[PDB]
Design an enzyme around this catalytic site. Structure first.
Site, mmCIF file in Angstrom:
data_model
loop_
_atom_site.group_PDB
_atom_site.id
_atom_site.type_symbol
_atom_site.label_atom_id
_atom_site.label_comp_id
_atom_site.label_asym_id
_atom_site.label_seq_id
_atom_site.Cartn_x
_atom_site.Cartn_y
_atom_site.Cartn_z
ATOM 1 N N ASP A 187 0.511 -1.224 0.201
ATOM 2 C CA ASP A 187 0.055 0.111 -0.354
ATOM 3 C C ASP A 187 0.883 1.193 -0.107
ATOM 4 O O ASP A 187 0.448 2.451 0.321
ATOM 5 C CB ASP A 187 -0.989 -0.066 1.266
ATOM 6 C CG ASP A 187 -1.816 0.891 1.087
ATOM 7 O OD1 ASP A 187 -2.621 1.210 -0.117
ATOM 8 O OD2 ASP A 187 -2.278 2.288 2.016
ATOM 9 N N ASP A 211 1.306 2.632 7.828
ATOM 10 C CA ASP A 211 0.784 2.038 7.550
ATOM 11 C C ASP A 211 0.676 0.237 6.964
ATOM 12 O O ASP A 211 0.853 0.381 5.587
ATOM 13 C CB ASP A 211 -0.473 2.574 6.465
ATOM 14 C CG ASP A 211 -1.680 2.420 5.947
ATOM 15 O OD1 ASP A 211 -2.147 1.420 5.386
ATOM 16 O OD2 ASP A 211 -2.527 3.863 6.058
ATOM 17 N N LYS A 270 2.086 4.504 -1.425
ATOM 18 C CA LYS A 270 1.223 6.344 -1.595
ATOM 19 C C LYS A 270 2.096 6.676 -0.889
ATOM 20 O O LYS A 270 2.676 6.992 0.427
ATOM 21 C CB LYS A 270 -0.350 6.260 -1.370
ATOM 22 C CG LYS A 270 -0.993 4.733 -1.605
ATOM 23 C CD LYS A 270 -2.432 4.632 -0.809
ATOM 24 C CE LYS A 270 -2.367 5.279 -0.093
ATOM 25 N NZ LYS A 270 -3.972 4.965 0.849
ATOM 26 N N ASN A 306 0.659 7.235 2.972
ATOM 27 C CA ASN A 306 2.000 6.295 3.845
ATOM 28 C C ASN A 306 3.436 6.935 4.210
ATOM 29 O O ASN A 306 4.534 6.518 4.819
ATOM 30 C CB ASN A 306 1.619 5.198 3.441
ATOM 31 C CG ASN A 306 0.407 4.673 3.447
ATOM 32 O OD1 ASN A 306 -0.644 4.973 4.375
ATOM 33 N ND2 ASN A 306 -0.307 3.532 3.147
ATOM 34 N N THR A 308 4.864 -35.409 -7.317
ATOM 35 C CA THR A 308 4.817 -35.636 -8.460
ATOM 36 C C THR A 308 3.289 -34.882 -9.235
ATOM 37 O O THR A 308 2.853 -35.546 -7.795
ATOM 38 C CB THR A 308 4.620 -37.577 -8.801
#
Ligand SMILES: C/C(=N\O)c1ccc(O)cc1O
Length: 283
Positions: free
Chosen positions: A119, A140, A121, A124, A158
């Site tokens: 997040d 954040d 941005k 933040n 397998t």
């Protein structure tokens, strides 16, 4: 209204907003920031924060699990990076570099420690002071993820009964951290130009289509003021293929970050912050 839990009130004197409030630690009379989350995923965010120790990543000072969650954090007097870039406002290239360098160190530390923020941005990214030359901190961690996977255990057997989509996913697995490098690219684009690379403003192409194609909005008049080295770094982070996209290490080795002056200014801010905490050492 309502009241604060007695346990919080015992240790802190609560004050004004910036959900984040200003508070005073009673023991020290020092300013703190208290994050109020409305009421379990927060406990993982607490767990991640307590384990991390980097100067460009926010530190948790205390926690209160009551009617709501109360997270005591270090106060950032400069506020959010968002406030510096909002409404076509732009930072001087040198400032973008200093802030970006710190965002790269913080995200490289996260990736080294098996954490993806998810997040990133301007909201933040917090600034340590009202000064242009300051320390930044990533915040954040609510949407954050911890990097053996279910795929590794599945590949150990397998594949007689194994579905094709699972085998096809082996190509891209372990590239989730690349989402943070894309976010950093968009943050860097915004900081340099004062405008977003992908938006619904004055365009026919859908926001989704702009991103998947990786056809960002380039305005020559705005970008002419910005160096070719800075734009080259943006281009390398805004790569659609997550496997080709620049990592934090590739971004840190990029020519634009080979700036001894910017690096010195960062080491200087670090020394100034640490000055109050420095214990005498063995000579
Ligand atoms: C600690 C924090 N966020 O996590 C915070 C939030 C807003 C602000 O202006 C200052 C801050 O320190």
């Amino acid at each position: 209204m309502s009241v604060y839990p007695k346990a919080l009130r015992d240790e802190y004197i609560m004050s004004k907003t910036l959900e984040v409030k200003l508070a005073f630690e009673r023991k020290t009379c020092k300013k703190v920031a208290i994050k109020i989350i409305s009421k379990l995923n927060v406990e993982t965010e607490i767990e991640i924060l307590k384990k991390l120790n980097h100067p460009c990543i926010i530190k948790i000072k205390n926690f209160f699990d009551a009617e709501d969650y109360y997270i005591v954090l270090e106060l950032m007097e400069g506020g959010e990076l968002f406030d510096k870039v909002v409404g076509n406002k732009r930072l001087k290239e040198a400032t973008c570099k200093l802030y970006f360098y710190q965002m790269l160190l913080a995200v490289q530390y996260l990736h080294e420690n098996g954490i993806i923020h998810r997040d990133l941005k301007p909201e933040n990214v917090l600034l340590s002071s009202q000064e242009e030359d300051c320390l930044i901190k990533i915040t954040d961690f609510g949407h954050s993820k911890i990097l053996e996977t279910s795929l590794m255990r599945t590949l150990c057997g397998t594949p007689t009964y194994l579905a094709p989509e699972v085998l096809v996913s082996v190509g891209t697995a372990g590239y989730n951290r690349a989402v943070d490098c894309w976010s950093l690219g968009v943050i860097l684009f915004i900081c340099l130009s004062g405008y977003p690379p992908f938006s619904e403003h004055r365009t026919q192409v859908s926001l989704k289509d702009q991103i998947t194609s990786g056809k960002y909005n380039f305005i020559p008049e705005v970008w002419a003021e910005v160096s070719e080295k800075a734009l080259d770094l943006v281009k390398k982070l805004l790569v659609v293929d997550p496997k080709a996209r620049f990592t934090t290490e590739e971004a840190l080795r990029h020519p634009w970050l080979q700036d001894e002056d910017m690096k010195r200014k960062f080491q200087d801010l670090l020394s100034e912050e640490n000055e109050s905490t420095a214990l005498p050492q063995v000579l």
